[PDB]
Design a protein around this ligand. Structure first.
Ligand SMILES: [Zn+2]
Lengths: 226, 122, 324, 129
RNA sequence: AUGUUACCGCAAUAGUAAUUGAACUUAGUACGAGAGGAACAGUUCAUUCGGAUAAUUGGUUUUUGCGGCUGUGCAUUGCCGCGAAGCUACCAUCCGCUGGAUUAUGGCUGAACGCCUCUAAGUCAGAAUCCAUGCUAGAACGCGGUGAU
RNA sequence: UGUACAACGGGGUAUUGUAAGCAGUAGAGUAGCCUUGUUGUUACGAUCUGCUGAGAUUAAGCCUUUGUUGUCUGAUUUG
């Protein structure tokens, strides 16, 4: 089920795409090859939405959300924001976040129940995550790395971390998650696992340079075969 | 906003304090002009102070803060508080795990890995 | 090129676009007067560019468009020595602007310009209709004689400008009959030019070096604005009821209560200058030509200083009341 | 999108004004270089009499109105309703009318009291002699 | 200067015609065992050149426009705060990668000569060559049309 | 001898940043006066507040003008 996909001669996937259980966000830049690749995958089941966030092709690092909600930063323009609201149904919640940093896919990683955040986030966004996403919030670093989304990929299946994560840290964090963890490489040695690939409960999409041992790791810990 | 011979900050957590640009990669060739770096530019930069292991060696570095007012495509003239760059490979893959301070939107659009290690965009 | 000055300040059109005789009889160029420059917000629709579906801010030049009126025609027959007008045909009633144009001392002349020509419609038109049927018979190409409504313009010169326009519709006889109906009547650019048209500009540049004829090509028309519209400065996004006239007006020019053309980019010449707007010499298909632009917001602030409002109602709404 | 000037509170537009961004990612737009250089010198708009920090801090105009309840940046977006659009247009025009009326009538309170104090002060220039 | 004058024009002729690169896609395909990896098209920007331009950005001269400073008749625009207007600038913006026939040269298939060959048939690229197109100027002793006298 | 022109005047737009002058209990304090104060008050008091986006400039190459006021002519050349 694991599908290698490339966007504009770049192996990075979570940079330009945002994947939940119930929708997918794609960029508008370059060509429709990357969008048709998800259409081959996702199809008519979940809506796949072309979007920019403050005029960017980069949207998965800009956005952090679950099946129930989607958080966008302050700089999101209301033309884009109204297009997202007309695009996504009532079951998905959208709200701009008035905070210092803008990149959310680096700073908030989550699933439908548990979110790890930046441990030095403001308290208002820490409120808003458990309000909109309806998830449990934990201030945590994955192996002392304060960016928690690019270094740790989550679903309701399981979780994947970068290889510098200690096994003590994996158990320390999976007790909070209640889903298992594996130190994994992606895109041939790139430690950035959250932007190198996206995952939801039935699909994991990664770059072309993600090797077959790495695909076996993802296919095991996120259970891509039924 | 930065010509050849410009001290800029170090916004990653690698250990360098300041980055001294000695060459600009991908600049034009006109007599008596200076190769000028700006936002979203990978230039050769030397470390002046910090860890001596990062000192005495040039590294490629992408500039994330410029502090000279540019014209963005949407109508705004804007500039950061200071000059800042982050050192990386020529492949654009970051050395630092977390990049502190605001990172430019064009620069994060240019490099996927810098945006992967960007905490603050603009 | 040797940089010698322009002959006339009204620059010549040396070449016209190609005649299609399958299209209806219509003009090929226009003469307007440039008011000034401003800045336009619009969205870019350019796949292949990173700025696709993104707000762009663009410099434009606006030329005041008074409606142009036709007062004559000129047919050229082919000779082996080149094009030569066998005759020109005038209408009867011509304004003091145009009769002023023939004169150097209009203020003290007895204004005797086209007196005995008016006796040529005192008759049935026999000589004149003979000449029209001659230009039907001979004279393979047709140029019409047009002048502007310069009294409807903040120009201090009351003397309007006459020009020839090659008429690239079909049927030379229908062409000269078309001009015959269009004698002393008006033509607006809305029947000639349209939105998104790639046009060329023929104008004498700013003297100080300068004062040279220049033809700058491939400029997309952004707005064919109508004079009766009070929403000239408006968009479907910019729902203000405001004109294209700047706050305080165009600098050193006046205003535009007439029609106008807002065209992309820059243009040779200065303000208060006569400029020929010609349609393109070929069908450009560059996708910079085919672009159906969609505006968002129009700057109408002061260029007499650092402006800070768009309408004066906005000015009073922010500043409240005053002592005065 | 219209933003306010940081130093004037004046509406900022595309092409108009300079933005400064500090290290804590806080954008500050200035409608002109007078505002921008005034910010460069670390000045207080409460000191400068013309800008609206002083005028809304001073009481020349009213500063809180029930008409102001309508203008607010909303982070949760609303799905498109075409039929609400013209009602919001009528609301903006009508509420701006009411705001200018309340502001002028608020200034109408100011000019009546000088009659009373001029009466009370020209009694002092008469009753002493 | 060619009776005059005025406008609109024609064109004998003179010159003039944008440099270089990479971003998608065609593509991870043709191809290659793999390693790896095209190109014609179709889109997008960059360099350089040329011509314009002040909406904006920035610089600059004439400001003696507003407010303020420091004095001893002065400060080579006395200084400063905040600003015009003009000039100018890939420091700011826009527009212009015009088409054919050719020389040398580099080739293809291919006999004449069963090997062989850019040539004999045909044909691809390629000079500031020639023509077309456009632009700029217009014979000051080139011309035409038209007005009133 | 006319939507004619021009000197004013007016309106618009922009610049600078609260003009002069009035009032005070606002003013760090010093004397002064008693009704020795639970702000008792009178004089000096750089400054501050209200009158006050006030006041000043505004085309000399900004725009407009149902207002006023004056104006309109000589020398040379051609069939
Ligand atoms: Zn301001």
């Amino acid at each position: 089920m694991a599908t290698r996909t490339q966007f504009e001669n770049s192996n990075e996937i979570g940079v330009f795409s945002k994947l939940t259980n119930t929708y997918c966000l794609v960029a508008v830049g370059g060509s429709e090859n990357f969008y048709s690749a998800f259409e081959a995958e996702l199809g008519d089941a979940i809506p796949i939405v072309h979007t920019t966030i403050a005029g960017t092709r980069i949207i998965g690092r800009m956005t952090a959300g679950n099946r129930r909600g989607l958080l966008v930063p302050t700089q999101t323009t209301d033309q884009e924001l109204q297009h997202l609201r007309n695009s996504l149904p009532d079951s998905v919640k959208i709200q701009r976040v008035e905070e210092r940093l803008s990149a959310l896919g680096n700073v908030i990683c989550c699933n439908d129940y548990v979110a790890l955040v930046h441990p030095d986030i403001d308290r208002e966004t820490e409120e808003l995550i458990s309000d909109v996403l309806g998830v449990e919030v934990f201030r945590q670093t994955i192996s002392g790395n304060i960016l928690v989304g690019s270094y740790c990929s989550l679903s309701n299946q399981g979780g994947l971390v970068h290889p510098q994560t200690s096994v003590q840290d994996q158990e320390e964090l999976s007790s909070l998650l209640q889903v298992p963890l594996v130190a994994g490489t992606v895109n041939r040695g790139s430690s950035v696992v959250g932007a190198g690939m996206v995952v939801n409960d039935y699909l994991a999409v990664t770059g072309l340079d993600t090797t077959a041992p790495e695909l076996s790791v993802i296919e095991s810990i996120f259970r891509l075969q039924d | 906003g930065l010509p050849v011979g410009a001290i800029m900050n170090c916004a990653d957590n690698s250990g360098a304090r300041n980055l001294y640009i000695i060459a600009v990669k991908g600049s034009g060739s006109r007599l008596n002009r200076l190769p000028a770096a700006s936002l979203g530019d990978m230039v050769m930069a030397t470390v002046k102070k910090g860890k001596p292991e990062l000192r005495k060696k040039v590294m490629p570095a992408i500039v994330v803060r410029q502090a000279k007012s540019w014209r963005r495509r949407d109508g705004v003239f804007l500039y950061f508080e200071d000059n800042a760059g982050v050192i990386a490979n020529p492949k654009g893959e970051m050395k630092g795990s977390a990049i502190t301070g605001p990172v430019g939107k064009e620069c994060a659009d240019l490099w996927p890995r810098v945006a992967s290690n960007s905490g603050v965009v603009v | 090129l040797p940089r010698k000055r322009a002959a006339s300040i009204r620059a010549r059109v040396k070449a016209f676009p190609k005649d299609d005789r399958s299209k209806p009889v219509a003009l090929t160029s226009f003469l307007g007067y440039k008011a000034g420059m401003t800045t336009i917000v619009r969205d870019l629709d350019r796949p292949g560019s990173k700025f696709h579906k993104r707000e762009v801010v663009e410099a434009v030049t606006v030329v005041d468009t008074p409606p142009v009126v036709v007062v004559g025609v000129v047919g050229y027959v082919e000779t082996p020595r080149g094009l030569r007008s066998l005759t020109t045909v005038w209408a009867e009633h011509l304004s003091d602007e145009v009769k002023r144009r023939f004169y150097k001392n209009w203020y003290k002349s007895k204004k005797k310009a086209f007196t005995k020509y008016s006796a040529k419609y005192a008759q049935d038109g026999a000589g004149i209709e003979r000449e029209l049927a001659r230009i039907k018979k001979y004279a393979s190409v047709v140029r019409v004689l047009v002048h502007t409504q310069i009294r409807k313009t903040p120009l201090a010169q009351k003397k309007a400008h006459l020009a020839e326009i090659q008429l690239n519709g079909g049927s030379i006889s229908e062409k000269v009959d078309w001009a015959r109906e269009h004698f002393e009547k008006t033509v607006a650019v809305d029947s000639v030019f349209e939105q998104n048209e790639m046009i060329d500009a023929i104008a004498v540049t700013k003297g100080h070096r300068g004062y040279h004829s220049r033809t700058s090509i491939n400029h997309k028309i952004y707005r064919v604005g109508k004079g009766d519209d009070e929403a000239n400065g408006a968009t479907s996004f910019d729902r203000t009821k405001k004109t294209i006239t700047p706050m305080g007006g165009f600098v050193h020019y006046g205003e535009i209560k007439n029609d106008f053309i807002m065209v992309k980019g820059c243009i040779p010449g200065n303000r208060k200058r006569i400029v020929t707007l010609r349609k393109s010499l070929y069908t450009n298909t560059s996708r910079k030509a085919l672009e159906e632009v969609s505006l968002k917001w129009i700057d109408t602030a002061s260029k007499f200083g650092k402006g800070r409002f768009q309408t004066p109602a906005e000015k009073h709404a922010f500043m409240g009341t005053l002592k005065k | 999108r219209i933003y306010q000037c940081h130093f004037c509170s004046s509406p900022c537009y595309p092409g108009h004004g300079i933005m400064f961004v500090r290290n804590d990612a806080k954008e500050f737009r200035f409608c002109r270089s007078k505002c921008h250089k005034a910010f460069k010198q670390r000045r207080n708009p409460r000191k400068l009499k013309w800008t609206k920090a002083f005028r809304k801090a001073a009481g020349k105009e009213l500063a809180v109105d029930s008409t102001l309840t309508f203008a607010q940046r909303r982070n949760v977006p609303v799905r498109y309703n075409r039929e609400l659009v013209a009602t919001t247009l009528k609301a903006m025009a009508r509420i701006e009318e009411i705001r200018q009326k309340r502001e002028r009538a608020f200034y109408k309170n100011r000019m009546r009291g000088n009659k009373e104090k001029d009466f009370l002060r020209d009694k002092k220039l008469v009753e002493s002699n």
